[PDB]
From Swiss-Prot, chain B:
The chain holds residues 534 to 581 of 1273 of the full protein. This is Spike protein S1. Binds to host ACE2. RBD also interacts with the N-linked glycan on 'Asn-90' of ACE2. Cleavage of S generates a polybasic C-terminal sequence on S1 that binds to host Neuropilin-1 (NRP1) and Neuropilin-2 (NRP2) receptors. Interacts with host integrin alpha-5/beta-1 (ITGA5:ITGB1) and with ACE2 in complex with integrin alpha-5/beta-1 (ITGA5:ITGB1). May interact via cytoplasmic c-terminus with M protein. May interact (via N-terminus) with host bilirubin and biliverdin, thereby preventing antibody binding to the SARS-CoV-2 spike NTD via an allosteric mechanism. Attaches the virion to the cell membrane by interacting with host receptor, initiating the infection. The major receptor is host ACE2. When S2/S2' has been cleaved, binding to the receptor triggers direct fusion at the cell membrane. When S2/S2' has not been cleaved, binding to the receptor results in internalization of the virus by endocytosis using host TFRC and GRM2 and leading to fusion of the virion membrane with the host endosomal membrane. Alternatively, may use NRP1/NRP2 and integrin as entry receptors. It comes from Severe acute respiratory syndrome coronavirus 2. It comes from the Viruses.
Length: 48, 48
């Protein structure tokens, strides 16, 4: 069934572009690290 | 004196730093400037 397995794989890699592209919480785990660090620094700068 | 780190007391605002020309327009009443984190990031020279 090589031709279908190859097309299903080829399409799924195609959808992965869109699902990553639009949904907001897709890159949430990486973004939360960046935000958590910035708030921690900002409180320190404000506690001055 | 501009472009040289200097101790500066403006109209009672006191700081140490380098003074350069800038691309932001203050409103007429507004005298001194500030940035996120509440640092004094601009001054309008009192005489000129």
């Amino acid at each position: 069934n090589q031709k279908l397995i190859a097309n299903q794989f080829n399409s799924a890699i195609g959808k992965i572009q869109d699902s990553l592209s639009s949904t907001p919480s897709a890159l949430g785990k990486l973004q939360d690290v960046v935000n958590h660090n910035a708030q921690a620094l900002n409180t320190l700068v404000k506690q001055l | 004196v501009k472009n040289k780190c200097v101790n500066f007391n403006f109209n009672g605002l006191k700081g140490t730093g380098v003074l350069t020309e800038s691309n932001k327009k203050f409103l007429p009443f507004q005298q001194f400037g500030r940035d996120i984190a509440d640092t004094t990031d601009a001054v309008r020279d009192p005489q000129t």
